[PDB]
Each structure stands twice: as C-alpha cells, then as structure tokens.
Write a protein that binds this ligand. Sequence first.
Ligand code: FFZ
Ligand code: MG
Ligand code: ZN
Length: 333
Amino acid sequence: VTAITKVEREAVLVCELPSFDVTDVEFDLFRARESTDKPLDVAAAIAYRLLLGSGLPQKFGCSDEVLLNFILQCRKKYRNVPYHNFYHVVDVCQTIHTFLYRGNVYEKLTELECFVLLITALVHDLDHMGLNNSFYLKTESPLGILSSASGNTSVLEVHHCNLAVEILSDPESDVFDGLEGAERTLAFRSMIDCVLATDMAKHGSALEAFLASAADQSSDEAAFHRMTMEIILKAGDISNVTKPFDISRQWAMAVTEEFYRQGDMEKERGVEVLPMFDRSKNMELAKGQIGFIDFVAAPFFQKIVDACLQGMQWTVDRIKSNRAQWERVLETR
Ligand SMILES: COc1ccc(C2=NN(C(C)C)C(=O)[C@@H]3CC=CC[C@H]23)cc1C#CC(=O)NCc1ccccc1
Ligand SMILES: [Mg+2]
Ligand SMILES: [Zn+2]
C-alpha cells in the first residue's frame, strides 16, 4: 500500500466538527456528512477524535500520526457502495465507543481490548463490494470458489481480515506497533476473531456462546473477554435500529438500496433472488424494519443487556420506540 501523504493527514486535521459530540448516543453521522463538502474527511476526523479522546492509542505507543495513517489506509479500501462504505465502519466505531463508555461495557474488558475494538470497527468490512457471502457462493465467483476450496464460507469476513493484516504490516499504519509478545498476539487474534464473528451465519451460535459464558460464574476469563469483544462488534454492526428514528431510517434506506442492487445483479446472472433483495416485490420499509427488530435485533440486544450489559439498556428502549414509530407508520398509511 502507498504511504499516507502529509496533505492527506492535513485535510483531516482541518475538520473541526463544530457542534458535534462524537461521544453522544444521539450523534448523527448523516448530519456530520451533510455539514461539509468533504464528508470523507469529516468521517476520518470523527474516527480520529474518538480514538484520541479514548486516551487508548497514547497508552499503547500509537502516535497521533500512525493513528491517522491507519484511519486513512482503511478509508482508501472502502468502496462507493450505498451501505457497506466508510461511513458504516465509522458509525460502528462511534457506536462501539458509546457501548464501551456510555454503556460501561469498558468495565468488562482491558484497555487493550477496548483499543482493539475501536480499531477493529474500522477494518471489519474492508473492500466490501455491496454483495453478501451468499452471492459469491451462488454465482461460483472466484472468491466464492476459493472459500469453498479452502473450507471457510465466511467469504467476505476472511477477505476483510486479509486486508487488515496488510494495512497493519506497515509500521507507519500499524496501530499495534507499540505492542509485542502476548499483547501483540492478543490484539491481532482478537481483531480477527471479532471480524470473523460479524458473519451473520454465525449469529445464533455467537450469541448462545456469549450468553452461556456470561451465565457461568466459572467461565474462562480470556474466553469471556473474547466473546464480549465479539458480541460488541456484532452489536455495533446491527446497531442501526438502536439509533434515533431518522438516523435509523436513513440506514435502512441505504442497506435496502444495497440489497436491491445485489438483487439486480443476481437477476442478470440468473441466480436465486430472495424477496428482500428484489425491487419488484416493492416491500415497505416499515415492515422490513419491524421484522428485523422482532427476529434479529430486539432479542439480541435484550438478551445481552439482561445477561451482562445492563448499562446498554437504552438500546433496548430505542429499539422499542423505533418499533412503535414504524407501527405508527403502518397505522396511518
Ligand atoms: C438497517 O437495517 C439493517 C441493518 C443490517 C442488516 C444486515 N442484515 N444481514 C442479515 C441479517 C440478512 C446481514 O447479514 C448484514 C451484514 C452483516 C450484519 C448485519 C447486516 C439488515 C438490516 C435490515 C433490514 C430490513 O428492513 N430487511 C428486512 C429483514 C427482516 C428480517 C431479517 C433481516 C432483514
Ligand atoms: Mg461485514
Ligand atoms: Zn459491518
């Protein structure tokens, strides 16, 4: 990868984020993006401020400059797709910050693990092309073939991990360069385990494992820490419905458009299109979100809060009010 230039860094350091509290659960990244003519710089600046403000990079020998380099190397590898772009991973970073510090999940982890989570948020979807794992397998795409051949069906997640390892292999962008021995190993393994755990095919088993570990007073500590990390990246990854309703809605619009574009390409390639990917089925956003809330997000957040993350109660509350607002959209249609 080409080194980050001084001009690239300055363009981020310029951004001042006047009127924004990046630590707030009601922070609005869409408003931040609209605020400016250079949304990519503002997004980078948000990530930068979150990481420096945590106090964590400083404690792990990561310089302000290596941090900004890392952020900009991550940025270069996100594509202009509707949802799985740089704004999503910055959003996940910001959201995880809130979970750690507003939800007090930081209490469950070491400072290094908190640092790893914030960093992992920015790598966890590198070079996403707007197509899910299933597309690559169904179309016998080269990436799909390689996954099947090598025995790992987490097509995209292994790819993300590959590119994270590349970025971090250069000291100029290695936010873990200040680490050695077992700390450096834990950083890489936990980062990778977390990204691998974002494959929604593993959702049920990841959740089950965490819940079982959390219920067990005699769980292995290292294992509980690792599963807590996995659950928090997962939580951030499906956190759109925990946001204030107009933020939540904009996310649903973007993901819906990404799905529809995949559906279009599936049609052209003559492979199976699921209803939720099909523009012609014309399905209402309100029912989409309610279904996601009922079948995925509300059980997830409720169970982890009840089991262990009591401080993240507000996520359950916002999901509940978001569901009620979508139901009011139905009621008045
Ligand atoms: C902002 O809403 C969303 C935010 C995220 C996702 C994601 N879905 N999945 C899986 C669950 C299909 C992924 O694997 C994506 C990649 C990794 C993590 C989560 C991602 C879906 C929606 C939605 C919706 C929506 O209205 N459809 C209706 C729906 C109903 C039931 C279940 C899923 C969708
Ligand atoms: Mg992903
Ligand atoms: Zn993601």
